[PDB]
């Protein structure tokens, strides 16, 4: 259950990982 969630500014959403 690996996932990369990085929230920087107030308009960014990066969700890329395993499942």
XYZ file of N, CA and C in Angstrom:
57
model
N 0.842 -1.187 0.000
C 0.000 0.000 0.000
C 0.880 1.242 0.000
N 1.750 1.323 -1.000
C 2.679 2.439 -1.130
C 2.065 3.561 -1.961
N 2.136 4.781 -1.440
C 1.589 5.943 -2.132
C 2.404 7.195 -1.828
N 2.522 8.073 -2.819
C 3.274 9.312 -2.658
C 2.344 10.520 -2.671
N 2.020 11.024 -1.482
C 1.139 12.178 -1.355
C 1.898 13.394 -0.836
N 2.139 14.351 -1.723
C 2.857 15.567 -1.362
C 2.008 16.804 -1.637
N 1.603 17.487 -0.571
C 0.788 18.688 -0.697
C 1.598 19.937 -0.369
N 1.913 20.719 -1.395
C 2.682 21.933 -1.193
C 1.804 23.167 -1.085
N 1.584 23.886 -2.200
C 0.752 25.094 -2.207
C -0.733 24.772 -2.067
N -1.573 25.780 -2.278
C -3.006 25.585 -2.172
C -3.653 25.286 -3.511
N -3.011 24.427 -4.297
C -3.528 24.058 -5.609
C -2.666 22.977 -6.252
N -2.175 22.054 -5.430
C -1.338 20.966 -5.919
C -1.741 19.637 -5.288
N -1.809 18.596 -6.111
C -2.184 17.269 -5.632
C -1.519 16.182 -6.469
N -0.497 15.549 -5.902
C 0.226 14.488 -6.596
C -0.016 13.139 -5.928
N -0.668 12.235 -6.654
C -0.967 10.903 -6.136
C -0.521 9.821 -7.114
N 0.669 9.278 -6.876
C 1.218 8.232 -7.730
C 2.034 7.238 -6.911
N 1.557 5.999 -6.845
C 2.255 4.974 -6.089
C 1.893 3.572 -6.542
N 1.790 2.654 -5.588
C 1.447 1.271 -5.898
C -0.056 1.116 -6.103
N -0.786 0.963 -5.007
C -2.233 0.803 -5.069
C -2.944 1.795 -4.155
